[PDB]
Amino acid sequence: NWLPPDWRTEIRVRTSGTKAGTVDKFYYEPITGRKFRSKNEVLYYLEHG
């Protein structure tokens, strides 16, 4: 819990290949739908919109 109001989250779970079973979390910006790959990439961009 640190995430602005309308922000969508998801996990991608790898189901084939060398990294089958790995879970990656993604954050999407509202209206735009802009994909971020980490906490800090979102924290950073809130500061520098």
Measure the CA–CA gap between 3 and 20, rounded to whole angstroms. 28
Q: Which helix (H) or strand (E) holds 47?
A: helix 39-47
Q: How far is the CB of 18 from its own copies (least distance, A)?
A: 10
Which residue number, 23 or 47, has a Cβ lying nearer to its own copies?
Answer: 23
26 phi, psi to nearest 5 deg: -130, 150
Q: Which parts of 1-49 interact with its own copies (CB under 8 A)?
A: 3, 7-17, 25
Q: How far is the CB of 11 from its own copies (least distance, A)?
A: 5
Contacts with its own copies, residue ranges (CB under 8 A) = 3, 7-17, 25
